[PDB]
Design a protein around this ligand. Structure first.
Ligand SMILES: O=C(O)c1c(Br)c(Br)c(C(=O)O)c(Br)c1Br
Length: 129
């Protein structure tokens, strides 16, 4: 599923991401924009053999099981395919664990390089929230 900008913001808010760990909703929408272009089915293979999955490009070395990332963990206790569903519940619940891990949203490279320090509120402007 390719979410609309305001449609994703509303779904993230209902699932409790707005202000989670102090990160306003615009940070999460911006992160999803540059990680996946709002596409829940996005996948990208990394040089280490791991793969990033879903709207927030969650990595199989630490967070989910894809059966092909040797020596990896599954800290969200989910198959990586669960991060590709049109229902973003699994991605949100796993992102909550990631953002609590110590480095905050710096775990998302696209967020650090393209959202952090910018006017992230623009990503929810015009949305009925
Ligand atoms: O906080 C957790 O341990 C957790 C995570 Br991580 C995920 Br992913 C899911 C899910 O949507 O599958 C659920 Br339910 C829970 Br509880």
């Amino acid at each position: 599923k390719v979410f609309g900008r305001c449609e994703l913001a509303a779904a993230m808010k209902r699932h409790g991401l707005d202000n989670y760990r102090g990160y306003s909703l615009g940070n999460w929408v911006c992160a999803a924009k540059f990680e996946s272009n709002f596409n829940t089915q996005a996948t990208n293979r990394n040089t280490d053999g791991s793969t990033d999955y879903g709207i927030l490009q969650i990595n199989s070395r630490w967070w989910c099981n894809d059966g092909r990332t040797p020596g990896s963990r599954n800290l969200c206790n989910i198959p990586c395919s669960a991060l590709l569903s049109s229902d973003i519940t699994a991605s949100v619940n796993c992102a909550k664990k990631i953002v609590s891990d110590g480095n905050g949203m710096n775990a998302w490279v696209a967020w650090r390089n393209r959202c952090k320090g910018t006017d992230v509120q623009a990503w929810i402007r015009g949305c009925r929230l």
